[PDB]
Amino acid sequence: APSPLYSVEFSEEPFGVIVHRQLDGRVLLNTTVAPLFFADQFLQLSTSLPSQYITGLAEHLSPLMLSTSWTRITLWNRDLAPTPGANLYGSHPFYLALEDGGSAHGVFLLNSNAMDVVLQPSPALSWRSTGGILDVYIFLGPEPKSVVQQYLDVVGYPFMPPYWGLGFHLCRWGYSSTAITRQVVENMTRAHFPLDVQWNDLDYMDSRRDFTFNKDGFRDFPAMVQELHQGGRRYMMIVDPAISSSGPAGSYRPYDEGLRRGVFITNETGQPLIGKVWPGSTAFPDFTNPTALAWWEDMVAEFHDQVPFDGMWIDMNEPSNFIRGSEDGCPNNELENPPYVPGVVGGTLQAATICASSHQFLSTHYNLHNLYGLTEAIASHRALVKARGTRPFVISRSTFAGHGRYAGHWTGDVWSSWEQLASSVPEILQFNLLGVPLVGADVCGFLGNTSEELCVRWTQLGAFYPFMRNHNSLLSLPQEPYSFSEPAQQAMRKALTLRYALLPHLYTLFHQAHVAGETVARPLFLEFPKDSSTWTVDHQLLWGEALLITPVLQAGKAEVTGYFPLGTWYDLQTVPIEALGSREPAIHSEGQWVTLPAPLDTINVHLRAGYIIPLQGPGLTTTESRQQPMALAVALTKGGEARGELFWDDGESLEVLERGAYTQVIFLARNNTIVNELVRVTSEGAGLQLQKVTVLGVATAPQQVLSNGVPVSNFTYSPDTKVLDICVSLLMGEQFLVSWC
Amino acid sequence: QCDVPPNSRFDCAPDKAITQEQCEARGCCYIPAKQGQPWCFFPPSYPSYKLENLSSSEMGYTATLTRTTPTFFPKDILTLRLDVMMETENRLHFTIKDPANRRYEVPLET
Ligand SMILES: *[C@@H]1O[C@H](CO)[C@@H](O[C@@H]2O[C@H](CO)[C@@H](O[C@@H]3O[C@H](CO)[C@@H](O)[C@H](O)[C@@H]3O)[C@H](O)[C@H]2NC(C)=O)[C@H](O)[C@H]1NC(C)=O
Ligand SMILES: *[C@@H]1O[C@H](CO[C@@H]2O[C@@H](C)[C@@H](O)[C@@H](O)[C@@H]2O)[C@@H](O[C@@H]2O[C@H](CO)[C@@H](O)[C@H](O)[C@H]2NC(C)=O)[C@H](O)[C@H]1NC(C)=O
Ligand SMILES: *[C@H]1[C@H](O)[C@@H](O)[C@H](O)[C@@H](CO)[C@@H]1NCCCCCCCCn1cc(CCCCN)nn1
Ligand SMILES: *[C@@H]1O[C@H](CO)[C@@H](O[C@@H]2O[C@H](CO)[C@@H](O)[C@H](O)[C@H]2NC(C)=O)[C@H](O)[C@H]1NC(C)=O
Ligand SMILES: *[C@@H]1O[C@H](CO)[C@@H](O[C@@H]2O[C@H](CO)[C@@H](O)[C@H](O)[C@H]2NC(C)=O)[C@H](O)[C@H]1NC(C)=O
Ligand SMILES: *[C@@H]1O[C@H](CO)[C@@H](O)[C@H](O)[C@H]1NC(C)=O
Ligand SMILES: [Cl-]
Ligand SMILES: [Cl-]
Ligand SMILES: [Cl-]
Ligand SMILES: [Cl-]
Ligand SMILES: [Cl-]
Ligand SMILES: [Cl-]
Ligand SMILES: [Cl-]
Ligand SMILES: [Cl-]
Ligand SMILES: [Cl-]
Ligand SMILES: [Cl-]
């Protein structure tokens, strides 16, 4: 029946907006609960919440479900190693609120000013902003997945990454030559560890300047990167926002050209604001200035003509300042000293950043600070499209709402600790809810020294981060997979092998994010919201609808206890996976906690009954893996049914969906048959070979297995595991029928 | 007037440390917590905005909001415009703005 899902009414005095869910009459928003404040530098709007269960308001180190016990959450982008109760690198003024029975709604306050959000146990929320206007969106769901899709209809669907971006990335601060960088690739290859992307940190630079490389350790930088490409790998390197202002005039084009075109944030007298970062004295590009976007595009394209890098790692883009405000301090005005200062670390908006009253093209830094990182990610996305002519790959530290339309994220300077390993699961899930699915933490941790046991568990869990990079700080012990004992290497190689086998599935999950605003890594409550036991689960994750990951997140554990929603969950260890180098088969759950064996060499992964997963053969790169034959894993319901899909394209071209340059196939199991349904077949995906079908939950040994009506060359049935393993010679792009009886 | 359940008290001194006398001078309620919860909080009669001239549009509603008593913050905007937009079956959108001055707005594509 045609009607909105919401009804709206107003209180006259005191003023309030009241929003009901029409279907059940539930009050979702009621701003009558507290006074409306609207002063030049202080806005406050309050509401009742429908339950104690609320998620969002990144970026903070906390449980997925936020505490309503008098919690003050501060949104002010800040360079700080993740720690509880602190404003960190990004700001996302969006929450999703759960309602008794499993419906949900979302609220987005489109405001980029420093703000506090105060949660209290009535339960209620107060938005407190230091500027701008109140611009509020309410998303009625009713399903939590639909709330996220509706939010992303406003801020942007996630960008489609290149296929190679889903491979393993390896980085550290301290690879101080091309000779050392080449040895990392050699050492990974020798020990049969997949590696798609070699990174460098600031080591490559000449005197710590952007768009340079030193003529000592990195003299042959262009050749190193050309050689990586010849072997089928990609190359990434750090780019900082701040531009060295100290060099002789005419000797450093990024500063000289930036000055000519007026690209920099300026101060009260109209000159560049000068801060301190790696190069020493630096100016800060204004990425709200159209001329700065043109200058950045030129600097990136010119540097790419010297060194053909495949993407940009943009760090320090809060913007981060080693000193407070500027080398010349900050003036005494109401922007630098506002009447309400939110709960920021350091108790001032200037701490670890630039003056709030500094000038940008669109407004003052006071209003635009929380967009700085986002504006650099947009500038860099555009620069990479123009320089390379294929899909960009931007990984950004600082973020704002809508970031995921342009770039990915990593959670920053996490400690090599069991606590930070455990904390990474809620943070990766939170960024998926916020439309930044290309997210992960530094595998084995960034700060301090990892242990072998921690790096095994972190690699196991980190193989299920949508963005998987091992990165390490300058003063840390090495933590490359090849640096550990043989048994630890075997466990890390198994985790990377399983991730590579699942890349066709992970890529299809990114396709659904990009076309339909879906999540890639998702909490159990998004998939089973009507089961209230899922609401507080944040140490397990799903990939899409079907793959449940239950990691060990503590030292000395050989088991883990996880929640299994009602249904059958097949142990993925019953699916054969080919590796280049060296327990119940099914959980029948009523909706309950289950203790699983989890020795050091194991991470628990279960496949939900009713789902089909596409898999691909092994490689040390996606260049190799993408040429391999494919396999299906078919998880049957009790009733013999399953469904899945595969999205395939060339893995890097722009405008694939608009041009139709892709293959899309649906798989259906019913009545002892497996078929494909061809949604779209083109030259990209036409050659895809299917050589193996594994069927889980086959109750009795078949007497015959047919492919297109003819007995297959070979099959195995395991009566202990109920697994039917079938050898076939089929094409994803041509209609087939596999059957058994 | 000050009989507000502890969990439903909204902070009337979010800006500074306040005394009972200063709290009561703002027209707020002072009740120490028994052991966080604000000690200084708004009574239900604390001055807010009043809705005036609510009007129906094809997209939803518009109104004027008027504050008669200043807050303890400087530069209250005493006259605001409310716009309510029923954009889709799933999406409701409202803005509160200063009708006399363009204020900073986050750049956002339609
Ligand atoms: C706005 O930014 C500009 C930089 O773009 C600031 O210019 C700086 O002004 C200070 C003095 O106020 C200069 O310091 C002086 O240096 C000279 C010699 O180097 C020394 O003899 C003086 O005793 C003093 O230390 C500084 O050189 C200059 N920086 C540059 C790069 O030129 C300007 O102050 C900023 N305006 C405001 C109001 O903050
Ligand atoms: C509430 O609105 C009334 C009436 O405004 C008029 O009708 C509206 C639909 C719109 O078209 C306006 O432009 C009209 O002026 C306002 O009362 C009027 O105030 C004006 C200006 O002071 C005065 O000339 C009229 O005589 C008033 N008319 C009446 C019938 O009283 C009123 O000010 C608005 N309230 C607020 C708080 O803005
Ligand atoms: C960003 C990212 O988080 C990491 O993954 C990267 O590996 C890091 C390196 O690129 C990067 N963070 C680097 C942080 C450096 C911290 C420096 C602390 C500054 C203290 N300081 C400096 C000064 C004087 C100014 C000197 C200017 N050179 N005073 N205090
Ligand atoms: C929205 O919140 C307001 C304020 O909390 C509620 O209004 C109060 O309701 C109580 C209890 O019924 C009354 O005794 C008060 O007089 C009301 N205050 C005001 C200012 O009117 C209101 O019930 C809530 N609306 C809905 C639909 O839940
Ligand atoms: C790549 O692996 C090689 C071989 O293991 C490493 O070189 C050895 O490193 C040890 C230090 O632990 C030295 O004492 C040996 O002399 C080295 N052996 C050889 C054969 O040179 C090398 O350090 C690794 N490089 C990187 C970048 O990981
Ligand atoms: C990491 O190990 C190195 C080498 O023993 C040591 O110097 C350093 O202090 C360690 N760091 C921490 C934080 O323990
Ligand atoms: Cl809770
Ligand atoms: Cl419903
Ligand atoms: Cl302008
Ligand atoms: Cl402005
Ligand atoms: Cl429970
Ligand atoms: Cl438990
Ligand atoms: Cl064929
Ligand atoms: Cl007192
Ligand atoms: Cl006061
Ligand atoms: Cl005033």
Residue numbers in the entry:
A (entry chain A): 204 to 785, 794 to 952
B (entry chain F): 81 to 115, 123 to 197
Please share excerpts from the published article on this structure.
We developed and applied fluorescent activity-based probes reporting on either human GH30 lysosomal glucosylceramidase (GBA1, a retaining β-glucosidase) or GH31 lysosomal retaining α-glucosidase (GAA). Gaucher disease is rooted in genetic deficiency of the retaining β-glucosidase GBA1 (glucosylceramidase, glucocerebrosidase, member of the glycoside hydrolase (GH)30 superfamily of glycoside hydrolases)10 and Pompe disease is caused by genetic deficiency of the retaining α-glucosidase, GAA (member of the GH31 family). GBA1 and GAA produce glucose, but do so from different substrates and by following distinct reaction itineraries. However, and as dictated by the opposite (compared to glucosylceramide) anomeric configuration, it does so following the reverse reaction itinerary: 4C1 → [4H3]‡ → 1S3. Both GBA1 and GAA-mediated hydrolyses proceed through a flattened 4H3 transition state, a feature that, in combination with the occurrence of a covalent intermediate, can be capitalised on for the design of covalent inhibitors and activity-based probes (ABPs).
GAA processes its substrate, glycogen (α-1,4/1,6-linked glucopyranose polymers), in a related Koshland double displacement mechanism. 1,6-Epi-cyclophellitol in turn is a mechanism-based retaining α-glucosidase inhibitor. Substitution of the primary alcohol in 1,6-epi-cyclophellitol for a reporter is not an option – inhibitory potency will be lost – and the same holds true for any of the three secondary alcohols. Substitution of the epoxide oxygen for an aziridine nitrogen and installation of a reporter on this nitrogen, as depicted in Fig. 1d, does yield an effective activity-based probe that, while not GAA selective, is in general in-class selective for retaining α-glucosidases. Ensuing copper(i)-catalysed azide–alkyne [2 + 3] cycloaddition with TAMRA-alkyne yielded GAA ABP II. More broadly speaking, the work described here also reveals that substitution of the Bodipy-type dyes we routinely install on our cyclophellitol ABPs as reporter entities, for the TAMRA dye (commonly used in FluoPol-based assays) is not detrimental for probe affinity. We confirmed this also by crystal structures, with as examples (in the ESI†) the covalent complex of rhGBA1 reacted with a previously reported Bodipy variant of ABP I as well as that of rhGAA reacted with TAMRA-ABP II.
